[model samples]
Target: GEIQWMRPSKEVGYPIINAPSKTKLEPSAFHYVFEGVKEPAVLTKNDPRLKTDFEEAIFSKYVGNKITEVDEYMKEAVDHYAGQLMSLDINTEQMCLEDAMYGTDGLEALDLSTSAGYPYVAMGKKKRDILNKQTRDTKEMQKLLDTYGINLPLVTYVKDELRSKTKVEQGKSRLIEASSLNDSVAMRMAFGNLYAAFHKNPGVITGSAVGCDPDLFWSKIPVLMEEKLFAFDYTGYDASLSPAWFEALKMVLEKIGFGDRVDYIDYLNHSHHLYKNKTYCVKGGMPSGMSGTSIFNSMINNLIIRTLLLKTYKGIDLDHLKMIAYGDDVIASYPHEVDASLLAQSGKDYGLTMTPADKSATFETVTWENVTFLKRFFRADEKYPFLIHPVMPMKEIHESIRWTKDPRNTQDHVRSLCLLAWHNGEEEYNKFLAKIRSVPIGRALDLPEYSTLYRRWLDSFG
Candidate 1:
C-alpha cells in the first residue's frame, strides 16, 4: 500500500512562517539586504505628536462614537479608554490552583522561553516632567485643557470611568472560543484554506492574510492591496467591548464549581486605577497596557475583524477569508485587489465614521509598517510572495544581527534554517547566504564548521 499522506514542509530559513501553505517565500526573489527603511529615530519627552496621536485617538476611535455620540475608530489611548460592553468572571472549577493541567488534554511539547518578545519597556519621566513644567499651576492646566473644551472631569471619565465602565452584555463565551482556539482552530482553518487557494490561483490566494489590528481599524492595518499597494492602514473599526452579566457569571461559576468568591479579581476587564501604576481600567476597552487580564474583549474584537472582511465582502470567495486573532493583533490576508476605501466603507456601513486622513487610498513606495503575512519590510510581489527571516537590522525582519556574533548561536541558527528550508530550495537559501555575506552575520554562516548546516539549508530548500 502506498502512503497516502506525505506533505512536505518546504519553507526555508524563516521562523515566523510555520504554515505548510505559507512556506514558499520570495522576499523580492534573492534579496539579501532589506531596502526602503529610514534610520530609526528616538522619541523623548518633547515629541508633541507622540501624546498628540494618543489624545486624538480616544475621541476619534476607540470609544469615540460611544462616548461622544459619533462614529469613530477608537484605539488604545488619549484620555478615555474603552471598556468591554460586558465583563467576564472566571469561575474557577474545583480544578484548584494546584490542578494546573487540563483533564482531557495532555500538554504538547512546547518551546517555552521568556527571552524573546515583551521587549524592554521604556519610561516616560521626561515626558511628564516637561508637561508639569509647562502647566506649572492648576489654573494654567485647566486653562490649557479648556482650549479643547476638555476638563478634568472629562479626562477622568475618558481615562477612568469609561475603562471601569461595566454594564450588562448578553452572550456566551464567543470571545473565549476565539482567543483560546486561535493557534489551534483558526490557524488550522486559515492555513488549510490558504493552501487550497494557492492551488486555485497563487496570485489571488497566494498566502494567508495576516490582519490583526485591534485598536487601529481600531489598530491600523498593514495590508497588501492592489498589487503591492501596501501601506500603514486602518479599518476604522473601533473595537467595541464585550458582555457577561452577574447572573450569567454566577451561573457559569456554579456550573464550573468555583462560584464562591469568584467575583472579585484584579484581572477583571478594564477594572483598576492608576494608583497601581501603568494601569487605567478603560472599562470600554480591553486595556492593552496590563501585564495580564481577561481576553474577552480583545478576542471578540478579533472575531469582528474576520467577520468584517469575510462576511462583508461577498464579492470575494468569503468562506476561506477567515482569520485568527490573539488579543489586539490579528492575522488575515486579502484575496482580491484590496480597496482600502472598501474597508472604510464597510465600517461606514456598519455606522462607523470614515476619516479622510485615515482613509488613505495610499501605497508605500518605500517603507510599510506592521507587515504580517510575508517579506514584511522588503519587496514581496505577487509572483514570489514568499516569507524569509529578515536580514539583520531590518524593519520588516528581525534583530538577530548578533546571531553571527557567536558560533553557538550560529550553529542553532543554521540548523533551524536548514530544517525550515526542508524542501523550500537550496538556491533560495544560498541567495540568502550570499546576501548575508554582505554583513558580519554572513561570515558566521560561511564558516567551515557550518558546512553541515549550509548543506542542510541547501538540500531541503533547493
Candidate 2:
C-alpha cells in the first residue's frame, strides 16, 4: 500500500555550485572610528613602516636623494613666513561695531556674564585701538604683504568685494552674533575669504605627503617603529635588534641633521623595554611567523605595551578597560570613583580638561560629546559635533550595525574592494584578492592600526 509509482520521466541537469547566501557581517565599533580618519589610502601605505625596521631603507630609498631639496624647500618656506608675512589694516567700522556689541572693556575679566565677559575681550581691545588709529604702522604686516606680492589697496578691495557677495551678506548677521557672543571674528572673516582665494588661486596650498611633514613624522615615526619591533622582534632579517638599537638609531638620526627629534624614539624604546618581559599569546603561538597574523598581533601587543608605558612612566593611575570589537577607544576609569573636581584634576594631569559648556555633574548616561567636553570643552555646532554619534540625542552608542550591514558603500573604493574580497565573497573576487594579497608591500587593514594600538594600550588596566 505504501509503494507503487507507475512511470517516472528521466530528467537531466548540469552540476550547480550554489553561491553562499549573502549575509552581511556587522562592523565593530572600532570600524567607524577608523572610517572617521581623514585619509585611508595614505594610512595603509605607511602602516608597514610602523611595523618593520625599514625606516633606514625607506629614508634611504625615497627620501635620501631628496633630503637636500626638502631641507632647502622647508627652510625657504619658514623664511618666507618669518620675513614676508604681513598683516592688513583692520576695518574701523567693523572694529567699532564689535566694541559696541561687547561693551568695549568688558572682556578684561573672566566673568562670563555679558558679551564683554567672553574670552575674546583681550582680542577685542587689540582690534578696537588698532582700527580706531587708522595708521598703517605695522612693519610686520607690511613686510608680509610685500613678500607675498599682495597689493595694499587690493586687500581693502577684496574685503569690500567679499562683503558684497550673497553668502557674506547672509553670514554678516551670524558674524555679528558670533562677535556678540565673543566667538572668533577672525574665523568668520577667514571663511568669507577662503572661497574667493581658492577660486582665484588654487595653487596657493598644494603638494606635500600627508602625515609626512618633518614635525609630525619625527614625533610619531620612531614610536610606531619601536612598537612594531618590540612586538614582533622584527628588527633585522638576521637577528632582532636590541632595545638599545632604538636609542642608537635616534643618536644617528640626530647626527644626520634630524636635530634632537628623537624624544619620541626614546619614549618608545623606554616603554618597549619596560614591557618586553610581558607577552600576549593568541592561539598559534603569538602569530609571529605568519605575515598577516603577525601584523594584527603586533598591533594588539603594542597597545598593551604603550598602556603599561603610560601607567608606569607617566604615573597615570587609571584603569584601562576594553570593549569587544571597539579598538583604541580608551576609557580611563580613575582608581577611586572621583567627583567632578578630582575628575577635572585627573584630566588636567593627562593634559585634558572640561569644556566651559560641559555638564560635569552627571557621569553615568553620558554621551561621547560629554566625555569629549570633559576632556576638551568645545563642542561643534549642530551639523559637525566632531565626536561620532549613533542617533539623535543619543551620542555615545557605538554604531556597529549601521556601518557594516551594507557592503556596497564600504567596498565602493579601490582599497576597500580588496578588503571586501578578502573578507566577503565570490570566486572571481577571491582570484583578484589572491593576487593583491600576494604583493609584499603591506596593504590596508580593516582599521587604523596605530589608533587601535593606542586605544588597546590605554585599555590594558591592571
Candidate 3:
C-alpha cells in the first residue's frame, strides 16, 4: 500500500501525488539557506544600538510581563529548563540530549566542521573541527572558554535568570530571534510544515489557522535559555545542516555513560562568546540565528496549543483537529467550525498576543479551502484536506539562485530541490527544473543529481 499525497501549483489546483508507504525526506532537503541577506555591519566597542537594544529588551513588556506575574507559560519554561518538567523520566533527558546532538530520532545527520552560527564568531571550518574536539572534553572546553577571559558558568547561568537585569546586558546570546524582518520571514519560509506530519488526520474536514502574533513576536517569545545538550555549532561544507547542537553531538564520541558526560553536556550548553574580546550572553529568550532556537520555539508552542485545545474543546471529538506550527506561527484544522476569536485568545492569553479577529480568516462550507502556513499557500479544496502537500520550496530555490556569487548557495539549493523532487515526484520536479534551467546560472551550474543528493543525505545520518 502507498500513501496518496497532494502538490500545489499556480496553474492547476491541488494535484494528486503518490509515494511509497515508507517514504521519508532526506536531511539535505531540509537544509535551509539564507539568501539576499545584506551582511550586518560588524559590531565593535563603539556601536550605539548595542547598549540601547539590550536595555530596550530588558525593559520591554516581553520581559516585564513574565517578571511581573509568572504565569503557566513561564512556569513550564522554567521547570523544563531546570530539568524538572520531563527530565525526571530517566529516558527523557537521554532522548532530548540525543535528539539535540545527533538529530531528533536520527533525522538530521549534521556536519561538525561548520563553524558556530551568527553572533558567535567568524572562525573557519578547520578551526571548527578543532573547536568541536576541544569542547567535547570538559577540561579543554573550559580552558578554551577561559581564554576569552570570562566565566563560562556565570555567563550561562545569568541567561537562566530573567527576573532582573544582568551586568553584561549586550552579549552574544541575547534572545535576538528575529534580528530583522528578513530573518523571521525567511525562517518561517524555510522551516514550514516540518512538524506537520505529527498532526496528520485522515478522512476528516481539516481547518488550519496560523497562530497570529503581534509585531516582533519572535523577540517576545520567552523561551528559557537552559543548559542542554544541543547547540547549532556547525555548517556543512557548502550547506547549513539542521540541529548543530554541538560542534558535533556527544553521540559522535563513545557513549561512556551519562555521569561521565555531565560536564561535556554543560560545556555544549554553556554557549557564550566574545565580540572583539567583549563578553556577551543571552540574558533572556533564545538567540535569532541559532538553529536550536527553531526547535525550542516550535516545541513550546506545541505544548501551548495542545494544552489550549484540550481545555477548549473538552467534550468534542478532537481527534479530527489538526495542528502544525513553526515558532509561534500555527495552523489548526478541524471538521467543526471553530470560533477564530477563541483561537486568537489562546495565543493572547499565553502572552504571545494576536492580530484582531477579523484579520484572521475563518470559513465554513467551502468547495475549495486555501490553507496558508509558514508564509506559503496550499490549496486544500480537495476531498482530503487533512493531508498536506509536500513542500516544493521553489521560492527558496529562486532566492538561492539570486545569490550565485557563492556557488555553495547554488549547490545547497540544488541538493534540497533535487531531494524534494525525487521524494515528491518527477513531473513536478521536471516542470520546476525546466524553469530553473532557463536562468544563466541554472544552465551553467553543475547541479548534484537527485540520486546522489539522496544517497549522501542518507549516508550522513546515523
Best by lDDT: 3
Error (Å) of candidate 3 at residue 220 is: 33
Off by over 4 Å in 2: 1-241, 272-408, 411-415, 418-462
For model 3, the stretches where C-alpha displacement exceeds 4 angstroms are 1-90, 93-111, 114-139, 142-284, 288-295, 310-324, 333-335, 355-369, 372-388, 393-396, 408-412, 418-434, 439-441, 446-462
Model 2: weakest 10-residue lDDT segment is 151-160
Model 2 clashing residue pairs (backbone):
84-144, 85-144, 86-141, 86-144, 87-141, 303-457, 320-459, 328-455, 355-377
Write candidate 2's Cα lDDT for 1-462 as tens digits: 000121111121211211122223444323433222111111111332133332222211111010112222223223222221112111212223232222233121112332221222323433343222233334432342335321010000001111113322222211011122222222122221221221222110211111122211222222222111111111111111123323333333333233333443332222110001111111111111111122222222223323333433354321231111111112222222223333333222222233222333434433333332112212232332332221111121112212444545443333443322221113434444444334332133342232343343234321
Models ranked on TM-score: 3, 1, 2
lDDT of 1: 0.29
Candidate models: Cα lDDT each:
0.29, 0.24, 0.33
Give Cα distance to truth, residue 290, candidate 1, Å.
Answer: 5.1
Over 1-462, each residue of candidate 3 has an lDDT whose tens digit, in order, gives 001121232123212211112112122221233233211221222344344454233313222111223334434333222232122222212333222233343134233543333223233223243233323433433343345432221111112211112223342222222121112212222222221221221111111122322112221121211111110111110011112222122221112122333333222233332222233332233343443344444444444444445446655543444444555555554556554446445544433444432133442221123333444333321333433333435544444333333354655666555654442334556665666666565576566554564355344432
Distance from true position, residue 381, model 2, in Å? 53
Residue 180 Cα positional deviation in candidate 2, in Å, after optimal superposition? 34
